Design a protein around this ligand. Structure first.
Ligand SMILES: *[C@@H]1O[C@H](CO)[C@@H](O)[C@H](O)[C@H]1NC(C)=O
Ligand SMILES: *[C@@H]1O[C@H](CO)[C@@H](O)[C@H](O)[C@H]1NC(C)=O
Lengths: 57, 31, 27, 49
């Protein structure tokens, strides 16, 4: 029973270290989807080992 | 990973999507 | 009201895209 | 590193950030992790020394 939950609108970071003011700037990079599912990790004792893949929030 | 077994935390996935950011006066992302 | 409506002003003058001022000023 | 001048058209190079212009004073509060500055047209506008 994997207790998936709505990731909401979290996971947004500053893509770059340059100051910008009042600008709606687009960017494509390794990102967390909006309104997606995040896999909770239980607390028992099962000792899974996970690959890193392209990116992990 | 390593765990101290005799704990709740969340993990997401990243991949090359795209965003439309919204910067503010102090350089802060508001949306 | 028109001036406060329409609003870039100088952000497109820093690369050589000089803007000649109107011969006739706004006033 | 060379001397600092202001209000003088100078070739300037800030850790690889090139550009030639006149450097003035501004009040645009940068974030501590923010290094450079841009504008709508992606023009280098405000720079931290
Ligand atoms: C996400 O998790 C919810 C449970 O809250 C489930 O109903 C839904 O089917 C899941 N969606 C995906 C794509 O896994
Ligand atoms: C930027 O920070 C100052 C504090 O020095 C604060 O007064 C101001 O409200 C902040 N800007 C915004 C848009 O909140």
């Amino acid at each position: 029973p994997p207790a998936y939950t709505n990731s909401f609108t979290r996971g947004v970071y500053y893509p770059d270290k340059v100051f910008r003011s009042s600008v709606l700037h687009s960017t494509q990079d390794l990102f967390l989807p909006f309104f997606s599912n995040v896999t909770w990790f239980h607390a028992i004792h099962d000792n899974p080992v996970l690959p890193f893949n392209d990116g992990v929030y | 990973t390593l765990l101290a077994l005799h704990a709740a935390y969340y993990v997401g996935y990243l991949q090359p999507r795209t965003f439309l950011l919204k910067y503010n006066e102090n350089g802060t992302i508001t949306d | 009201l028109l001036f406060n409506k329409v609003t870039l002003i100088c952000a497109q003058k820093f690369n050589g895209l000089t803007v000649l001022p109107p011969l006739l000023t706004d006033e | 590193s060379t001397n600092l001048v202001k209000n003088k058209c100078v070739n300037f190079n800030f850790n690889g950030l090139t550009g030639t212009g006149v450097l003035t004073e501004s009040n645009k509060k940068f974030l501590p992790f923010q290094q450079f500055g841009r504008d709508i047209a992606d023009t280098t506008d405000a720079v931290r020394d």
